[PDB]
C-alpha cells in the first residue's frame, strides 16, 4: 500500500507516528520501507521493531484479558471475540515473519543485523506459541527455539557480553524457556550466566554504553528475583 511513497518519506513518517504514538501507522510505514528492498540501518531496524512490538503488544494484552474471561466462563460471544483478536494477532506475526523471510534475514551479513532479525523471528514465533493449541504448536515452539538458538550462537561468537542486542536476546530466550518451553531451570541458568558475564565486561565500556547495558541487566535481575 506504501509502494508509491519514497523510502526516506516512509522512514520520516514512521518517526512522526512514533512521536504521535500511532503504532499501527508506524508499522505500516516501516513495512513499506522494508518492501523497498534495501537493507535497513541500525536506526531503521529499531523503528521496525518498536512499531510491531507495540502493535502485537496491545493485541497480546487484549488476548490475555479475553482468555481470562473465557476461562472463568468455562453464549459463544467470549470465545468468538477472543478468536477474532487471536486471528488478528496471528496475522500481524505472520506479516513480520514474512518480512524477515523476504528478505531481511538472508541479506543480513553483519552480526548486529543478523542477530537482531533472528531475535525478532524468535520473538514473533514465541507470540504465536502463546496462543497456539493445535497440531502445529510443537512446531511453532521449535521454530522459536531454532531462531533464538542461531542468534545466540552468532552473538556469543561475534559480540561482547555487554552488547545490548546480545543481552536482549538472552533475556527473551530465557523468557521463552520459562513461559513457553516449560524449562524454568534453563531460563534461570541462562539469565544468571548472561548477567554474570555482562557484569565482568562492564569495565570496558564508556558511561553511555554502561547505561545501555545495565538497563537490560536489570531486567535479567528482575526475572531472577521473580523466579527464585
Amino acid at each position: 500500500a506504501m509502494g508509491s511513497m519514497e523510502r526516506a518519506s516512509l522512514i520520516q513518517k514512521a518517526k512522526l507516528a512514533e512521536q504521535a504514538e500511532r503504532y499501527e501507522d508506524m508499522a505500516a510505514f516501516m513495512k513499506g520501507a522494508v518492501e523497498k528492498g534495501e537493507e535497513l540501518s541500525c536506526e531503521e531496524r529499531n523503528l521496525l521493531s518498536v512499531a510491531y512490538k507495540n502493535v502485537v503488544g496491545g493485541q497480546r494484552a487484549a488476548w490475555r484479558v479475553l482468555s481470562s474471561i473465557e476461562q472463568k466462563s468455562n453464549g459463544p460471544e467470549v470465545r468468538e471475540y477472543r478468536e477474532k483478536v487471536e486471528t488478528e494477532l496471528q496475522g500481524v506475526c505472520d506479516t513480520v515473519l514474512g518480512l524477515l523471510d523476504s528478505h531481511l534475514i538472508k541479506e543480513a551479513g553483519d552480526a548486529e543485523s543478523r542477530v537482531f532479525y533472528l531475535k525478532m523471528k524468535g520473538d514473533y514465533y514465541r507470540y504465536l506459541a502463546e496462543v497456539a493449541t493445535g497440531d502445529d504448536k510443537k512446531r511453532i515452539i521449535d521454530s522459536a527455539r531454532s531462531a533464538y538458538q542461531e542468534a545466540m550462537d552468532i552473538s556469543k561468537k561475534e559480540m561482547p557480553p555487554t552488547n545490548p542486542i546480545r543481552l536482549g536476546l538472552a533475556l527473551n530466550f530465557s523468557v521463552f524457556h520459562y513461559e513457553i518451553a516449560n524449562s524454568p531451570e534453563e531460563a534461570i541458568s541462562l539469565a544468571k550466566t548472561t548477567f554474570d558475564e555482562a557484569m565482568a565486561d562492564l569495565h570496558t565500556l564508556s558511561e553511555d554504553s554502561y547505561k545501555d547495558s545495565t538497563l537490560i541487566m536489570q531486567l535479567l535481575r528482575d526475572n531472577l528475583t521473580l523466579w527464585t
Binding site: 527473551n172 523468557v175 513461559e179 526475572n223 521473580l226
Partner: peptide
C-alpha cells in the same frame, strides 16, 4: 508476567 526486552 516476566520481563521480556522493552524500551
Amino acid at each position: 508476567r516476566p520481563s521480556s526486552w522493552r524500551q
